[PDB]
Amino acid sequence: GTSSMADIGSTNDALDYYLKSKGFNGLFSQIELSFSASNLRDRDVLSKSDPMVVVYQKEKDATLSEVFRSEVVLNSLAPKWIKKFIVAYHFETVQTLVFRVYDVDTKFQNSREEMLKLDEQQFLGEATCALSEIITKSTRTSTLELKRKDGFAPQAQPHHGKLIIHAEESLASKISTEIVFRCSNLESKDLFSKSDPFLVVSKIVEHGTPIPVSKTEVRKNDLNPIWKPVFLSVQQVGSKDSPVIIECSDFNSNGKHSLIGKVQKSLSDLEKLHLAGQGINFSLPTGAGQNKVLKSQLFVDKFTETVHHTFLEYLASGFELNFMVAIDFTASNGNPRLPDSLHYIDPSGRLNAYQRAIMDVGEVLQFYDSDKRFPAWGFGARPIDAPVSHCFNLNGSSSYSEVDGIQGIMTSYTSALFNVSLAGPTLFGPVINAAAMIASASLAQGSRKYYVLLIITDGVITDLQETKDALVSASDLPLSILIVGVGGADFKEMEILDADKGERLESSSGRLASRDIVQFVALRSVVQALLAELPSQFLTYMRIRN
Numbered sequence: 001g002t003s004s005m006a007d008i009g010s011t012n013d014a015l016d017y018y019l020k021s022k023g024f025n026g027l028f029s030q031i032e033l034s035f036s037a038s039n040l041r042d043r044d045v046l047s048k049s050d051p052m053v054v055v056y057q058k059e060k061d062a063t064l065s066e067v068f069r070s071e072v073v074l075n076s077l078a079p080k081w082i083k084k085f086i087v088a089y090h091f092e093t094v095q096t097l098v099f100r101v102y103d104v105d106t107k108f109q110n111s112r113e114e115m116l117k118l119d120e121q122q123f124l125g126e127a128t129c130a131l132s133e134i135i136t137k138s139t140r141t142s143t144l145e146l147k148r149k150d151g152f153a154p155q156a157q158p159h160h161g162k163l164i165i166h167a168e169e170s171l172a173s174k175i176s177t178e179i180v181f182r183c184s185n186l187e188s189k190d191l192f193s194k195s196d197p198f199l200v201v202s203k204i205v206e207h208g209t210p211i212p213v214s215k216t217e218v219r220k221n222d223l224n225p226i227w228k229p230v231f232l233s234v235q236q237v238g239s240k241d242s243p244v245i246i247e248c249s250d251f252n253s254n255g256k257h258s259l260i261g262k263v264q265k266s267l268s269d270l271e272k273l274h275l276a277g278q279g280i281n282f283s284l285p286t287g288a289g290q291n292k293v294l295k296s297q298l299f300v301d302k303f304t305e306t307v308h309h310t311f312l313e314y315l316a317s318g319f320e321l322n323f324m325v326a327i328d329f330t331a332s333n334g335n336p337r338l339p340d341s342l343h344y345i346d347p348s349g350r351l352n353a354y355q356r357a358i359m360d361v362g363e364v365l366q367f368y369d370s371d372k373r374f375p376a377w378g379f380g381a382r383p384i385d386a387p388v389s390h391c392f393n394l395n396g397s398s399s400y401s402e403v404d405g406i407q408g409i410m411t412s413y414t415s416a417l418f419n420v421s422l423a424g425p426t427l428f429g430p431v432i433n434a435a436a437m438i439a440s441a442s443l444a445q446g447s448r449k450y451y452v453l454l455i456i457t458d459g460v461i462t463d464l465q466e467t468k469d470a471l472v473s474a475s476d477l478p479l480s481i482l483i484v485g486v487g488g489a490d491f492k493e494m495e496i497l498d499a500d501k502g503e504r505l506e507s508s509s510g511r512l513a514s515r516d517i518v519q520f521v522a523l524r525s526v527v528q529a530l531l532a533e534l535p536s537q538f539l540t541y542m543r544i545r546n
């Protein structure tokens, strides 16, 4: 291998960071709801029924898809259903579900539930909620009153019983496999030199290039390397019986690394090797369809399937996501009273871009905080009689920034719009510090809050340096940040801040960010993808924190 200790050191440093950012990546989470009911009644009388719960998925257009259907419990005054419903959990979307309980006619006592027509059974009642509402309860159990439409009666509308939903993250979806590889007698292609070897584990595609899934650090002048542990979830590999590619390569600082050897084996195959203590010989390709078995061998020194502490594990341990908002009130935007102002409050009730982004994000994150007291700021405006503020409370107080609910944010916003003077220029430093001050204070008081600040701007920032410095400093606190650009401005300068598109942030004082905490996108939903990254950031913090 050709490279300096410095070239190696730094490619390893790049890897460490990338791993902490992707985490024990990609155990895409699944929930098991299980069901039971009490007091099922078509009218005012409770007698043995034959209950069945049926679960629909509510689309935004309010359309209903059937996604599950319990078995029929026979002759019961309180059924406890055996059949569980496994639904995927998507942190980035509200998953509205609708539950419907039916009293199955007795003539069907021998029918498989799949075969039942619901028109032919007694509809007892219905309830609705988001998945988010069930998995954020301490007991992970909700109790919902089944209701029917009796015509029109929000108060004295009769009950038809209670439906009781228990949610549990499914064990299989929490499993990752730690592996420690070791090789034996590696030969570099570069003759008369020792190898600087690393390993790449790649999922197999059919008729296209294999997708790298994991990578070991590079070791200097080692012919019998024992790497640090790499971790693999089942979704990264496919199934435990799915063959993967393991390539051993010789590192070259010039970026073109040379293949040392390659084997193809499943994660199951590796386990058998581990237990047996046996190694397997590597191969190189030679003839466009033949391979050569090397003297060099691969070994699996360690191999442990573990239950990884997942996002949902933390939520069930009483950890919250607390939403914060900061809104550009720079004149960039145009007078609120102008139809083509980005802050125009349409009389018809149509949301502007700031309202859209607030809802798109808040609507989801509101379920992960129990108090729903959300700090709300504006920046770049002149309040009555004062100079320009770069962090004033939207609610218009002097002492506190919290507002009640998304609703509270929306009314604080429309309120501020007509009680201050859009000014300038566009600065992010002060709000980020304000947020950090709150994060920090929460950390010191041993709270279990992690904070998500949404910043919405119409142009590019002025204080790019003092922003980096604030972010870098914030990276140690329980705080993620999402920036959303609105209107048609050129946001090119913003992309240096994005976790994905940008680069690891450097303080002016030289210090580096512990982790990626910023994302940016232009609201040309596109928000969904911003939300999808937060769990990872969330967990990164929890790993790193000290």
Ligand SMILES: [Mn+2]
Residues within 6 Å of the ligand: 328, 330, 331, 332, 333, 425, 426, 457, 458, 459, 460
């Ligand atoms: Mn602006």
